[PDB]
Nucleic acid binder design. Sequence first.
RNA 1: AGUCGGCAAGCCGGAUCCGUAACUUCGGGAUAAGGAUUGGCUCUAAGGGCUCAGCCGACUUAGAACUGGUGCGGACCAGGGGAAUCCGACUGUUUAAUUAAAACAAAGCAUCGCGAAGGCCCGCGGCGGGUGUUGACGCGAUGUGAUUUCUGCCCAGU
RNA 2: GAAGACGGUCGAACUUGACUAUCUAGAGGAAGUAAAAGUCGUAACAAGGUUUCCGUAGGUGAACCUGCGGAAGGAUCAUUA
RNA 3: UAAAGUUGCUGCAGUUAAAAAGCUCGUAGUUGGAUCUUGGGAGCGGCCGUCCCCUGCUCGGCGCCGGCCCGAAGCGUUUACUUUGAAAAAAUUAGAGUGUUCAAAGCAGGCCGCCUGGAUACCGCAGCUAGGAAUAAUGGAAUAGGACCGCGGUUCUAUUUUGUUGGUUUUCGGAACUGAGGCCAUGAUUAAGAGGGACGGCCGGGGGCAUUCGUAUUGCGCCGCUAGAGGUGAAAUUCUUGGACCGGCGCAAGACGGACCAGAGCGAAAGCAUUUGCCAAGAAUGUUUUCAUUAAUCAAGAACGAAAGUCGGAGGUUCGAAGACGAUCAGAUACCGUCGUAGUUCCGACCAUAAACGAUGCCGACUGGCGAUGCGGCGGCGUUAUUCCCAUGACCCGCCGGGCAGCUUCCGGGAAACCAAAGUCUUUGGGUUCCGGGGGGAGUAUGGUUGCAAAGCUGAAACUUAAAGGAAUUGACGGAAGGGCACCACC
RNA 4: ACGGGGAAUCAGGGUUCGAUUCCGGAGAGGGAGCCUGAGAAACGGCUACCACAUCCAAGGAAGGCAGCAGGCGCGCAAAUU
Lengths: 129, 91, 141, 149
Amino acid sequence: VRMNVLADALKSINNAEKRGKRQVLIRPCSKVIVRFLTVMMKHGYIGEFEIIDDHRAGKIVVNLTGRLNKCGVISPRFDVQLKDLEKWQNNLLPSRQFGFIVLTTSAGIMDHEEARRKHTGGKILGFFF
Amino acid sequence: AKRTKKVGIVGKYGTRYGASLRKMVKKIEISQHAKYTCSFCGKTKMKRRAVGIWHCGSCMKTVAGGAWTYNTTSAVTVKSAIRRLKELKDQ
Amino acid sequence: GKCRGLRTARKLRSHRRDQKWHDKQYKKAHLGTALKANPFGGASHAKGIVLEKVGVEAKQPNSAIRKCVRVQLIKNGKKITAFVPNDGCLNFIEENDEVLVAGFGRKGHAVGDIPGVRFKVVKVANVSLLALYKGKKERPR
Amino acid sequence: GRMHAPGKGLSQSALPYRRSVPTWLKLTSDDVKEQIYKLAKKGLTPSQIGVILRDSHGVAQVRFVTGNKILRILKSKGLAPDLPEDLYHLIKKAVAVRKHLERNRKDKDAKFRLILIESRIHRLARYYKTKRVLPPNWKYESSTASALV
RNA sequence: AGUCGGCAAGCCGGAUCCGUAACUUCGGGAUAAGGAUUGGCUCUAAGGGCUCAGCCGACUUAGAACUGGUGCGGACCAGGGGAAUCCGACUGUUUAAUUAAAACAAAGCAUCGCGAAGGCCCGCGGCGGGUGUUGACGCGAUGUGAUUUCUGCCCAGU
RNA sequence: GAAGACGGUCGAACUUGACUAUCUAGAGGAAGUAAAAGUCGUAACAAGGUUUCCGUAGGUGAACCUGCGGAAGGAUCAUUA
RNA sequence: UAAAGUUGCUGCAGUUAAAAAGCUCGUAGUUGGAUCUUGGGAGCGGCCGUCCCCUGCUCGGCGCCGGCCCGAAGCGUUUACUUUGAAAAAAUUAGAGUGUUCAAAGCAGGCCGCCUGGAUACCGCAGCUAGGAAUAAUGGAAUAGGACCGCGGUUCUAUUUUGUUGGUUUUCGGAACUGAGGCCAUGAUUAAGAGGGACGGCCGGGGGCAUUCGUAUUGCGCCGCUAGAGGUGAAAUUCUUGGACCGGCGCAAGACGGACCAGAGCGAAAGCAUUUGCCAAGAAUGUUUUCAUUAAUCAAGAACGAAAGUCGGAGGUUCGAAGACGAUCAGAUACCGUCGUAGUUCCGACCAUAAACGAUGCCGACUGGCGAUGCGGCGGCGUUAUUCCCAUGACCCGCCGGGCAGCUUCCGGGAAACCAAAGUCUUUGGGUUCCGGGGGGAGUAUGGUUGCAAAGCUGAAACUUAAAGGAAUUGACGGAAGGGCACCACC
RNA sequence: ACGGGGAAUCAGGGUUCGAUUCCGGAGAGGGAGCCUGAGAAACGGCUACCACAUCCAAGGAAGGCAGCAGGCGCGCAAAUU
């Protein structure tokens, strides 16, 4: 069955980007998904997305640019210290210049560099470059 | 507790008469001592009196049956066969 | 890995603990069968008594008569066929001479030409056989 | 997909977006309940109260005309059946297939279906136990099950 | 070590508590084998009826102390054991008065005859008689001999 | 206040038996691998000259053969109202 | 030890190279849909960056005119996670200082009595302390024994009090109970392109039992006419004037279910086909029905499981292991032929294996078209049936769901063959079972277990070996096929 | 298999070793018993038995290097009485 909902969302928008679709539809919408898309939208990797909030688990239509190489998800959500966060982005990110590791902290959901500024780690969600 | 491993009623014969003969008599000797439900009174009291004779200890009704079972399979197919030729002759 | 659960550690660890035994190199190192069958018994070398000088045939188109000796180890009492390594070195060795025997190099595996021989002589009567071959030393009698 | 079959069908109801009472429906939140009360007294499982209600009386969903659902309406009045209807219908089905099986014992397929049905009973039973709907010692026993039609 | 041969004699023996192998048709083997205990005396504990307390009643088990020249199932009663071979499955029977067996029987297995004017058989005789107050799941005639596993080739001879 | 003694306790050790682990002798039997270029065939690879193979039975010097049911890893992706 | 991404958590593999259990059920284990607080404001910098606030209820001094301000002490769902701090032997490691002549070291040394060093970091996991509240668990009130607000009574009790000396009752503070209230916006998220169940009309070689029919085959009876019939590459064994084969008419028995029959359907797989009846089951579809997470995959465990085989009965037409024989052959104990036992059939128990194959685990998502096809539903000209039209059938054109498939392609992958899955994989992580680690030895020995047996399940090692193997290419070869040629080929 | 601090080897993960100078434990041929003392089931302290072995006048007496050296043995394998 559908165990991980964030995984189905990322693999769909990653498939639709390789094909070159302009905008993709993802079936379930969760609070973590919309918080994940904004981290990608605030970096320019995706376009303007919209939530079709019906009376069920809503649907999201994400406008896609040609700027997304891959947006994977790490399952399960491992715990990340600030001591081993450098070692994760050493074998998960393409280079040290770009790419982001999205991880949730008590402060919220943000990329790995904002987790450096706020000086707190947490569970890892995914990554996009 | 379960006293025997695979020797039921025929445990009384001990080590006699060989394994296969002690095995094929088990299925029969279980049957000829089982109490059946009397189809007339409903109580589970049909018990073999003598070979072929089955008596219900409740309604006191005697029935001619099989030697070791209450109903012989050869008999029940004959009762159903006669029941078809009966209604087929008189229409 | 197949199961990536957050708390499937004992399932993953017990698997590798199980599947490791299907590795041929690992299974001989963690069972006595390889160590008991070893005439040396995990030792790098061993001393034994030479009791006859036997010539072993080669196998494939490489045809020759390989010179070996039938050694009886003194720690266990087992009999192994050591290979007198170098040319014309059989005349140094005699009968009833204690000789230091060593592995051949493939670690319990017949080597190239010779069939079923896993040991070579290095020293004879507590003088290196190479020194006898170079003439640096000679047999004291 | 179906949990005791290879079918992956996609067929079910789809209630509309608007959760409002229909503009045609003239039955108040009260009168609909006494309709449910009457059908429940003449013997009717909450599933088939809903169907009779949306064909003759034209109520879209009872959860919208009133604030509760059918079973929650009956239990507040004490008219609900004791053991749940979906569990009742599984025992009713297992009793029938077991009665077919006593004569036709060469029917290996019926024997196979029996295990599937009983497996579904023990699945709902241990669910209805955690929800404390059934007594924790409740147990479907094939023998005494036929007394519960 | 005697002797054809442990023949004869002996050992073992009851009970309580432990412990019990190969093999096996899973039932057994089995009291397997092998151990320990056992007296007398003085106590304690537990096990019931009848009206909480009182009043009646029986036997039995377990435990403890003391004690005797370590003796105690003190007489009587009372299994020597083990591991292997051969034969017959077993229980049963048999040469009264030299043979108790491996012989006979046996269940099991397999053949054969016969639908009654019949099969088998008796009888000097008869519309005779037995099986038979029977009817093929029966009666009559043979072989083999539980189970397990099998049962090969030969219809020329007779 | 010594020797010594009764009983108790801890208990080495010995005897015996059982269980267990490891090593090891063994007539004979039956395999595997290696050595060589032996004998008898020719099963397989080409439709390998009876298509091959699988499961299961039985049989035969030996590979193998045959029966029943499969498979194509087939020599057919096809055969006509 | 690295190399070894050949033990793979990071990070392997399982269509054909080693490999996915025959199939389903199923407990532990693992993993689990969505959903409950965001925003606004003062200040600063060039709509943007940063700070603080949305905390509630004993004691004291900037004090001020019961109230306010402030300081300290106590309380405020619980874990996981994360941040902080503490506590955390040295030596070693990292690392600061220092010209042991350098360095490995050492902990020393440096200035004309003084001046300094002997630091610091890391030390997991568990436990302790403080903050954060995303993520993931868990709880609250829907028989209200719910929360608050004041109450009224009951019982005991610190007592402060009765000026002191006593008893007593209380206001008094505390503890508990019991009646009447008042009040709450009085308490139930949604109804998953998750699941279960109900209901509706269907559908299908699904299953079971009973019943019915069909030729054929074999045998028998009778009739006809006859000398061969069978069988083969060719023959013989075999049948035959005691009348075979052939033709006719009957009868009996046991099998089997042709053509229709399809890259059609159904079933978990094995598998399933004459008629009709009965019995129970089911997928898919339809659904503004119900329940409300009940789910996914699954060690142990369980049901079913072709054929052969086994044990009992019944039956034995055909076929036919074994066997016998006739051919063939150097030999054939084989292929071919004639007989023919077990078996093949049914009933009741065992067995649990197949190239049980799609050589491809299951669940979920996503990623090209195209024409068909099966079932259900919806829509639409027209045609044809009842006829008397609407409605129903049969066609015709579409759409929807899922079902077996096909075609196509630079999706993408792959060693390639090939694959819309074997894709979304060094841009490596959706969940979860099983299972592989060079070739042999070997699925063998042994132990255990199951079975009546046959055997099944579990399952090594010694030893041996440098390859074994996969896909594809070019040749050679073929008692393979299709074309063509030569008197060193034939006619 | 004495444990740990640690050691070897590594990109990141790991894998292997740790008898060995520091801490902790255990033991003095094998088991057992105990005296003295604040502290021992001590062994460079006693008492037994077992194993091994020394001196004897044959009656007896005496012993414990897994302390430093050294010897024998054992071994592929380890230093000055």
